[PDB]
Subunit: 318 residues, 3 copies
């Protein structure tokens, strides 16, 4: 009978701290039919990353824009400069030149996201203004730039929507956990799954932002090798006293490893002075190495250690 | 190892306080094929609003009923009188004559719903008896009766279902936040969206109930004008010293404004002594004014203030 | 500005206590096209029930396996023996012979699941490793083995998926509340509903496990009678002073009741010395009675009490 003095369970604190940094992003076209001007071709969410005015949204919200417009919850509207984008992650960065003072996403670089943590997925879009949803972290993501990985997304059961994808995934304190990404069949804002949605983990989103600001695109390194891990894996003892490694299957012809030269069954033990313990770790490592770089790769060949010297190239198209 | 003395996180308190007021609503037909009697043509949820026995459900659960039956969780069954309904909101009110004492929905007219608050959507229906779901408020709704608005629904990610729609949306204390409404493609109990569901905000649901009890239907006022707001909007300073207003586009021919008479480019500054600051506010205001009413409308016409006097009519069909 | 010392709302405690008992279950076939070996025909989740190595998964994950493989989160892999299964519940039990010490699901036989309690649905499967989701208990289930019941499932809005169904439903303390069951259209791992998902309640899952370990299958008793409850039901007074009972409709011909012999309108008042108060209770009771058993059934026939003696048979195919 006395609700009066009680307090409803709520996540409005996360909302108050994070939402003013989450922006409407508009993709405007100039028509060809009757004379021209101001058509909205699509609409999406973006997140203000720093003072200075860099913003992340989805590449799919900005593709083929003639002009990119940004509107804040406080009423200010800006025209945006496209800094660059990346297909594999569906992220783009924009920049805005502003008037004394922007609201920014809270970010805690020391926070470790845990499976089971509560998250809110904050956008705007639909009926009017804002869709916000609640769920949990289902699976932590990896932070790699390797173009074949399938585990570089945090997964959540918070609904991720067209009113969702360009925006912020945050925990109950309003700290950024990831960038919302509409979730896996193709062409601006509605999908097939249900249950599970995806975001770019925030330390990956930050990495990719710094890459775009500095090169205009995500430059990924490449070694030109396919292969599987030798010694049977896991069970933390069972045991220690034999060296792991990557047996080589495939050597891209006229790839960096082929040049150099490296042959099918010869067993990679070390790459750029790190032990080659896992196929997956090692291809993420190679991906961050700048092209033009010369690195040592140690192999065992006929019971002998060879050190070859390899010059990294860029991962090549599609 | 010691779960024994701990307490599981739970919303069962909201359930215990609110659920006994949430009722099964049955729509029974008399057949035409073999001889007649007792067929259930559809089934839905309703909410007991006050002692006295008024109940809200969905119009779609009650349309074309020959007889309306109500069953409580405590075993009592009643036949219901249809008091009236409204298509635009998909609400209907019923009344029941009862035996000493009904369980009623807790309602707190002082509570302000916040974006991020936890809500449970309580029904009965399917497999047997009750579907209850949990989510958050995604967007607060407006409380207007203007028939073109698209923001008069609270939005939630709690699942809203056929076992859901006639019932109560409540917060963690069991206070009513809204009426569940199945959610946007047509004909008794299953839908297309996912992600986002809808309810009538509770102060709108209460308003519409009092309207039905007193007139048998929702009588909406009408002025017979389409138009857009002049001076560029928002940013809380930028600035103060010029009067907002509604420029007139369209004047319904032989509508109230046309009678009176009011012409295309002439700029509404005030309606029924309230400043005309926003298109949306002003059309909600007109909607609550009783038909037959004579009100002053101030315009600026050729740099001159005219006051016309306008007699409100009812908003007309479909 | 100070997130630093605060703590994010989270269910990671339930995860840490329950997840190490939730296993990958693989169904491997030997090919017929090119020469043979190791194909994965489907993949699912299972739950370790006790030391000793009994595991529950879904019957649908194991059907037609040539070999059943089990992988723990700690890296250990086992080959599994199929102990038995049950179509009506989509459960199977497996057994594994292990090396000093298994992680087991926490189970609290004294805990009473409440409508509104938070639950996590823990699996592994998809992109890589784990899907976990969060929701509430929507409806408590019954624990009966009667093959026509439709209320023997707990219902939840936690998403239940292919990365879900063989695994554990648990509350915020990590205690087992039920077995996840993909949720109602047919053939290994994706569905039609949305909103509502299903699990076997844990006291039913335990019952069915003990039955499989001891007989290799779920043996259900049968009486060979269809019928409805006499005196109008519910409202806890209204009143006490007349005996409930089951009027008999239908008597399976050459069923146990027919033998014995029992006739259409004659009114069951007691079964195996329990009052026959409810159709549903009484058919669950009959289902647990072992076949071969001789029990008294009291009826009222022409205002007279007859006691017949009935020998229970097994419920017969499909």
């Amino acid at each position: 009978f006395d609700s009066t003095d009680e307090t409803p369970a709520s996540y409005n604190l996360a909302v108050r701290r994070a939402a003013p940094a989450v922006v409407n992003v508009y993709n405007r076209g100039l028509n060809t039919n009757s004379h021209n001007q101001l058509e909205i071709r699509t609409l999406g969410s973006g997140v203000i990353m720093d003072q200075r005015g860099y913003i992340i949204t989805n590449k799919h919200v900005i593709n083929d824009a003639d002009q990119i417009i940004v509107a804040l919850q406080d009423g200010r509207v800006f025209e945006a400069l496209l800094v660059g984008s990346d297909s594999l992650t569906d992220l783009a960065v924009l920049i805005i030149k502003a008037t004394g003072g922007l609201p920014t996403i809270p970010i805690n670089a020391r926070r470790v996201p845990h499976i089971g943590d509560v998250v809110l997925a904050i956008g705007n879009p639909y009926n009017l203004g804002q869709t916000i949803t609640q769920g949990i972290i289902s699976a932590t993501g990896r932070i790699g730039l390797n173009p074949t990985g399938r585990q570089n997304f945090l997964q959540t059961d918070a609904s991720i929507n067209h009113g969702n994808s360009g925006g912020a995934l945050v925990n109950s304190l309003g700290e950024l956990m990831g960038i919302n990404t509409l979730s896996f069949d193709k062409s601006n804002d509605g999908e097939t799954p249900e249950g599970i949605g995806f975001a770019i983990p925030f330390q990956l989103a930050t990495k990719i932002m710094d890459k775009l600001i500095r090169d205009g695109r995500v430059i990924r390194g490449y070694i030109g090798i396919g292969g599987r891990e030798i010694a049977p894996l896991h069970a933390q003892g069972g045991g220690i006293d034999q060296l792991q490694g990557i047996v080589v299957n495939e050597v891209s012809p006229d790839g960096p490893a082929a040049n150099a030269g490296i042959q099918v069954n010869d067993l990679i033990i070390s790459v750029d002075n790190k032990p080659a313990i896992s196929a997956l770790e090692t291809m993420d490592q190679v991906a961050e190495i700048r092209p033009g770089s010369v690195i040592p790769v140690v192999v065992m060949r006929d019971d002998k250690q060879l050190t070859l010297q390899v010059t990294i190239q860029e991962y090549p198209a599609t």
